[PDB]
RNA sequence: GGGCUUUCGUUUUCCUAUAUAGGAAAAUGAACAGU
């Protein structure tokens with residue numbers, strides 16, 4: 001099953017780059033349907049403190065998985081743009097309970113593919129080493145933050161590892177805070193790894209780290225948020241020799257609604273590669289514009305007056321679930337999750 | 351090069367294979383053979399007979415990444431490619447030959463040999479107390495999270511590890527009755543032992559130590575002089591000399607610690623960055639400034655220092671002296687007063703064997719490593735230097751690994767009624783010794799401030815392991 | 818490079834039945850993946 005996902009992602013990337021560390025998100029309409037790559041990203045770098053922007057014109061994590069999630073968010077915004085009464089049947093969204101929000105249809109699902117393991121708790125194992133998590137040591141399961149000048153992470157202006165962010169996705173959904181105003185949380189059906197695949201430490205890292213001490217965490221999670229446990233798999237055949245070849249710090253991102261226009265960023269700073277220093281299309285400003293256009297189209301003038309921070313905090317359910325998940329992580333002995341100062345998100349669109 | 355399986359035929363119990371060697375665009379005689387291995391051997395053989403002289407076949411594709419760059423270093427590399435010390439060398443090589451007199455023929459390849467010799471008094475002939483070989487290191491993939499691998503296999507490093515094992519055994523043998531016969535004596539206050547003033551240690555390396563001790567052609571070989579004076583003569587011809595340097599993984603040469611701010615991390619190295627192990631010359635400098643006993647042993651002993659270094663090839667006084675001990679004294683003696691007794695710099699007598707053995711082949715350097723300690727008797731440990739484990743299908747634990755050293759430390763702490771140390775982890779136990787940690791941190795800070803770079807340390811998840 | 822851990826396929830031997838096919842022990846030659 002994962003071989004088709006990997007080959008689809010590789011073929012899509014090769015076709016788009018005809019004119020590596022590569023992640024993609026793939027939406028499969030039905031089981032018989034092969035599936036289509038919907039979001040694509042590459043990169044291995046993260047910005048430093050000097051590239052941090054208060055107004056949010058720089059992406060603070062050019063890693064492959066994060067940028068693929070950003071592309072998927074843009075794609076979801078596009079699909080919400082395309083939704084109407086006439087095209088309701090042919091779309092992937094259906095009315096949810098209460099009629100206040102839309103929701104993803106049951107048949108359509110999403111899957112994730114990463115060429116290598118996420119940084120953090122996903123590659124803490126040696127050659128010696130239903131979900132089957134592994135908790136043989138006290139140090140296992142701790143949060144780790146990305147280090148500058150490298151792909152690695154160190155245990156706890158600091159950006160959590162890819163594994164911790166995948167856990168946050170598996171608990172609070174993929175759509176983020178803003179799309180909660182118009183959607184129910186969406187969870188990955190499967191996670192596929194190309195290299196550095198351990199069953200015990202990947203399932204512990206992404207889903208099961210909050211189920212070590214029993215089911216005392218799920219009961220306190222208000223609906224519809226759930227502790228998703230996506231199916232975890234690996235590609236059948238793999239290149240033997242680990243690849244140590246030097247890797248450029250350019251990051252390529254693409255979404256299904258962009259046709260054949262890739263965007264290139266440099267992870268050291270987080271802007272489009274060019275002398276003019278163009279604003280990235282996966283930046284906070286573009287996402288806020290896209291949401292404010294969705295809100296204008298949906299006649300929800302209430303959310304227009306709210307800034308990025310106010311609109312993000314407007315989703316009471318999502319923010320409560322986020323705070324509860326953070327507190328549950330801090331309780332079990334994993335260290336405090338770091339959040340950037342609110343002045344970064346306190347920007348008003350011009 | 352390519353070995354093409356032209357054809358396979360015959361029944362499974364007696365197949366016939368037909369192989370052909372190809373180099374670039376030149377094809378060679380096709381051969382019949384009984385096994386694939388012998389197919390390749392005979393194909394190669396035929397190609398060689400055709401072109402031992404043409405050499406067309408020889409040029410294509412080396413596998414690991416390359417870069418000897420210090421400054422215009424390519425010409426330098428091409429030029430490079432093209433007590434009475436003799437007693438130390440004879441003792442070391444006789445001990446090696448006696449140990450491996452009738453073992454497997456796999457130890458007939460080229461090797462680098464290092465040994466540590468102890469002399470109990472003036473008329474002592476000399477006895478080998480350690481032995482190590484090898485020329486390789488581990489990869490970034492083969493690291494371990496519980497200390498089951500050796501991060502290096504250079505001859506001097508394995509020799510020092512064997513010396514550590516010998517020190518542990520000799521501390522085991524010590525007691526109140528046999529204090530006189532033991533090499534140790536009580537220090538001021540009796541808290542920690544110390545080495546007897548009549549006992550000395552010497553180190554012999556079959557070649558020059560990698561790093562700052564080998565940036566000169568073999569044609570720069572100074573002649574052996576029995577100079578009575580012990581005063582060194584370092585030479586600082588260029589700023590580039592004195593820089594620290596690491597043996598990078600899958601790379602050739604010995605490259606300085608650059609403006610490469612890549613922070614060594616466990617998952618980062620696993621994901622595919624380059625693993626940099628420090629050169630042997632830097633390690634020998636660290637021994638001369640801190641001691642050969644490491645950090646754990648300093649609980650029960652004062653630092654143990656060396657007295658002489660004997661090299662069997664590529665000796666240059668002005669280079670080696672700066673490589674091992676003089677590079678920390680270039681800018682005055684202000685570094686010496688910063689260090690705290692019993693930690694002090696050591697200036698061992700440098701020496702060269704009377705005549706080098708001219709047969710020093712450059713290619714065909716295998717990866718096998720050999721270890722031997724005094725307590726072991728006739729038992730030698732053979733390791734595969736690429737993986738850092740015992741060479742064999744079972745890849746069992748190496749007796750010089752961090753885990754076995756920790757086990758010996760626990761045994762000695764139990765024997766010496768040191769209950770407080772018995773409940774600490776490896777990293778905390780090393781950090782328990784305040785004096786050694788302070789001296790090491792000060793020495794690294796002095797190296798960085800004075801202008802030779804920054805020391806490269808393994809990921810914290812690898813030094814502080816789980817037991 | 819080495820090295821432990823399903824086959825294909827030889828003889829001998831044992832058995833079934835009618836020299837024959839089948840089953841079985843042994844080793845014999847290549848591939849093979851965990852270390």
Ligand SMILES: O=P(O)(O)O[C@H]1[C@H](OP(=O)(O)O)[C@H](OP(=O)(O)O)[C@H](OP(=O)(O)O)[C@@H](OP(=O)(O)O)[C@H]1OP(=O)(O)O
Nearest residue numbers: 060061066069159160165175176177178284312338339340
């Ligand atoms: O860009 P992402 O990595 O996908 O996540 C960012 C951001 O994380 P980074 O700053 O590391 O990029 C926020 O985490 P913080 O570091 O700011 O704490 C996080 O959550 P918050 O915005 O609530 O802090 C999230 O937001 P969401 O919960 O909607 O997934 C999202 O923020 P943006 O998409 O607005 O940049």
Ligand SMILES: O=P(O)(O)O[C@H]1[C@H](OP(=O)(O)O)[C@H](OP(=O)(O)O)[C@H](OP(=O)(O)O)[C@@H](OP(=O)(O)O)[C@H]1OP(=O)(O)O
Nearest residue numbers: 501502507510627628633643644645646752806807808813
């Ligand atoms: O090569 P070795 O002679 O075995 O030195 C190793 C190790 O070096 P490796 O990098 O090759 O593993 C450590 O060096 P770093 O990792 O820090 O670069 C260092 O450990 P410390 O710096 O923490 O002291 C040292 O320690 P010591 O001076 O006590 O001998 C010792 O470590 P082990 O004895 O545990 O092997």
Ligand SMILES: [Zn+2]
Nearest residue numbers: 063118119162
């Ligand atoms: Zn990452």
Ligand SMILES: [Zn+2]
Nearest residue numbers: 131207208229
């Ligand atoms: Zn799980």
Ligand SMILES: [Zn+2]
Nearest residue numbers: 504559560630
């Ligand atoms: Zn060396």
Ligand SMILES: [Zn+2]
Nearest residue numbers: 582675676697
């Ligand atoms: Zn000196």
